[PDB]
Design a protein around this ligand. Sequence first.
Ligand code: SF4
Ligand code: F3S
Lengths: 445, 72, 156, 144, 382
Amino acid sequence: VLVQGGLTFHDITELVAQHTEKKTPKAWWAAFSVAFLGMLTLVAMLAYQVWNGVGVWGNNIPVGWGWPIVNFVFWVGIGHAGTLISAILFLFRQRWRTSINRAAEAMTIFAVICALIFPTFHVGRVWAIYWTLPIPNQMEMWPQFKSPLLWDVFAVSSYFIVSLVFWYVGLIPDLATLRDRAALMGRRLRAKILGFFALGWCGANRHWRNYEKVYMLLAGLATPLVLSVHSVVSFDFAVSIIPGWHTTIFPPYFVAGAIFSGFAMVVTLMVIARKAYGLENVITIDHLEKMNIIMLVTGTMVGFAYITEFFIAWYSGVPYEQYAFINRATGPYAWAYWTMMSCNLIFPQFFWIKKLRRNIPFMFIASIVVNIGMWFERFVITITSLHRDYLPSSWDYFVPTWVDVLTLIGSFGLFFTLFLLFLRFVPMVAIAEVKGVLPEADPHF
Amino acid sequence: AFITFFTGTIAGFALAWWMQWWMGAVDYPLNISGKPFFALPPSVPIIFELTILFSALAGVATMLALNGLPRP
Amino acid sequence: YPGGVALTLAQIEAASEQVAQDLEQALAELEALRLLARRDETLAPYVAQYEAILEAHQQAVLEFEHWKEQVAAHPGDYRRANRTLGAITARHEALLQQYADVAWAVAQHVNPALLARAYTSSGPRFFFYVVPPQYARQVNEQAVPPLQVVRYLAAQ
Amino acid sequence: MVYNRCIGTRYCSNNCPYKVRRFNWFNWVKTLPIQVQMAQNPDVTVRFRGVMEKCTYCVQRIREAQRQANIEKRPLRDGEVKTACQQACPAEAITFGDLNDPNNAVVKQRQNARRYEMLAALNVKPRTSYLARITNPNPRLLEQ
Amino acid sequence: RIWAVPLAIGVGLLIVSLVGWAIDARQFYFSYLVGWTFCLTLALGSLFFVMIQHLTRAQWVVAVRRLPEALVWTFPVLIVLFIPILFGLHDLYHWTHHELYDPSSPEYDPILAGKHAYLNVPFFLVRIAFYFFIWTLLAYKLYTLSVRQDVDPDPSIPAQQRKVSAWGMPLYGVTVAFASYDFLMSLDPHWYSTIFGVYFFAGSFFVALGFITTCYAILVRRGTLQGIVRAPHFQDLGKLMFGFTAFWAYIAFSQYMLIWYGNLPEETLWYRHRLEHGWEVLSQVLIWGHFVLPFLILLPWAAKRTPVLVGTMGIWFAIIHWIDLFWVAMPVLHTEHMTFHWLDVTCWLGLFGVVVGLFFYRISRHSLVPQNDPYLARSLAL
Ligand code: SF4
Ligand code: F3S
């Protein structure tokens, strides 16, 4: 057993229906206020930006980037969590993901939206970005495929798509369920006509077998993509000549950062999706227990790389790469790295105490703090070796402006704004496979 | 329809690999960093990844084609 | 893209033959320079200053086969002949031009004057109100030798 | 560099050991008045927000020269072209004459013993293979 | 017997390969490394298979559980087979020469204040002899246990194996990284790469999945069993061989595109290996033969799960690690002359026989499939 619930096949439908039955929430009316206000602050500063110019962000030229692309790696590294528990957990077929899966590619796809805006916008010339695409354009010009900034585009313009199409396909039985309810019990007779995303669903033999092998396909075909998407977004760093980047362990590392970032947010959503609007019988606390292992895996795999970084400075480094990491510990950002590594190492090695700390309220206060180091992880790795790189002439601290922070905040805004939006429309839980996997769907009775 | 996934991988694979034999050397090349004109490696994460998109969607165009699922 | 690659393959051959005939001339001059200025100049870097081009010129001959054979192997891609021909003529006219710049210094020491038959010698761009370069290119072409530069110094 | 094709993702700059790919952060030229505009020379591409830029070896006066040699068949002399860093530095430090033209000053100043190659170790193979300093102290003479 | 034929033919061959340690001396020490570390990767890979089988517990591949556990106690025998390195250790790593830091030689190789603390050959003794206190301790704490839950079943049957996985787990991944940074990073120490601690790891757990898999595929056909271990068991092993072929080629290519790009001094692993001296031949015919033929042939699920194919792959999937690792170990000698010698192979077929000698003699010493176990019939009746 891996879900604790006194349920049958029917008990989920009445409940998740009650989570999508009628439209009168109040906490919604507060979240859609503060979150959309966050989104308003985002675009309030993001078109203030482009009419004016990039330098209102706090970017000097050595550190050309600052917080925006840092947040791109964040708001995509945060998102791999959702798609891989849809893919990986079917590849290993742990028959365990079902309680949370369908709420996760949401937690990916909206992250990818508030991610993709940054590559479109930390550039100065947004309008001239369609040149980046390989359209046969008005002259005989085409992009440069030796550039990981381009791989990012195809990757994310495929990863927004594959994760969507794998989520949209993931939620066909919902629309079947809701299309089936809209006639007999539901919002309106005209929600059925809205639920044509069922696409003539009947749950038949002839195509349900195909659905399995497709769900197998995208599992074994989005994971090789996930390991290339964030790896691309790491290749952009490590392909460079910078010593703090050219170290080759980074693509596995940042991926583990995406694990150790993404699940570090999913738990923040599940806790608050467990207290007020929660599923005690379907979101079993034992799930979060076995969830934080694959976090705590990367609670140490992330840690082993810091050793290698901190090691190769002592083993066979360039006399700059020797200095590159002494900078990280000792220098301006001692507030970051000493506390960051310690934050991302103490709390996981302080996590496993009382059988993985099943206690729910510790999850929120920890899952934040695990994640805050991630925004530092990419503010450290990117920038702490991007100044103090191969010249003293290019020595300059990075002062982030008051507009850097409202974009970060706004990224939380649009994330919650649009994550909540469809979430209230679609069903949260992967109700199709939940009642199909662990309960008595087995023919041995 | 893995035999129908056949045409998904090949065309995408050929697409990227034709998006560079047509692009990097023969039509508007460039001595960007001495990169030897669509040498394999920086093409791999496109000759791999862009294949995934155009090969997955065909993997699902089949899914939307087995007895033609859109029959509400 | 008029009629394929096989059209340009005649002129690219007509360039490589100019190179082959210049293997004789350059190596012939490399004998003559050792004969003309035996000891009338430094000559220790300045003779090797002329040889350093020569190992490149000969190296391009084996290439000009490889350049060309990569074209004539498959005549179905027009965007290689114009380029291989634009490369040859540049890799050709350069080496012609590099021979000259080393060969005009020969006269510059034997004669106290690098001669007024040296180059087009037109002038700056604001010296077009007086002297369009059109005049000059009909001076340079119809006066200056490409590689009859040191055989010219046999007359001195 | 082309001040047109760029977009402003700035990772043109982050690679380079020498953070010299500057970037037109704000649009300083748009607010430029009706007076200084006489001064920006009428031969080069002034640049708009969201664009990199760098030295270019004062390419502008390579072009008008090499073009002037494309009209009429010729080479480029030892001093037909002089860059701004060259023509202004009163100490004749910079020389700039075309490589692979052995009579020019650069080939004498590069063939010199101290072809100081700044951060060559990164296997970058750059031009402007410049020179070091030779500070000249004194024999003892009660110096120390 | 089943146990002594890979052993007597392999040790018959190893004792013959004493000729290597005697004749063409410096060749054999490093054909011994490419062999020795292969046996170690076999130990390293299939052990991590046991670990991950317990962390995110998997009752679906448990018939293929007891046999990896047999493979582990190799590594204690791999200790006493460390000896041939040690006589040639002063001849191999090029930092043991100690005529280079600041002696009278023309070379002051920048190793004095940087590396000499991490590397000093009596330290190298402990940097591996310490690992024998861990990777064997896993054996004496796991193999002593998992063989023993059969005859003396416990009240807490798995959760003691979990205890190994609770604190004996991470130290493994560490010691694998530093091991690779101590053995195979150091042949051309004019090189600095952080990933390579994983290329040794993944390139191990890549392989040993195959050897565990092909063993049953051999021991299913004319073995002691023929139908007990059903087909869909191996269906997972395929799903693993892909999910870890990715975790190899992701790494073997991230070692490549990153270093194909920058062209740094650390690249000199491959200005000598890849292009020159009959090894562009190797890398091409490697990668075509190492990633794509497996990733293509095994892919479709209409013969992916068949026993004899995946058994046939374990040959092409582990014999190739010679070709994978002969691209790392030996080429720093035959950098002048790519002429792979007969001694390069006697130790491959030797140690791949000698390890398997012990491997069957222990399966001769005691059981094969655990006579009682949690979820056994759940995986057998599958
Ligand atoms: S003067 Fe020199 S440094 Fe300045 S732009 Fe011109 S060439 Fe470059
Ligand atoms: S990376 Fe390229 S697109 Fe422009 S901003 Fe820099 S030259």
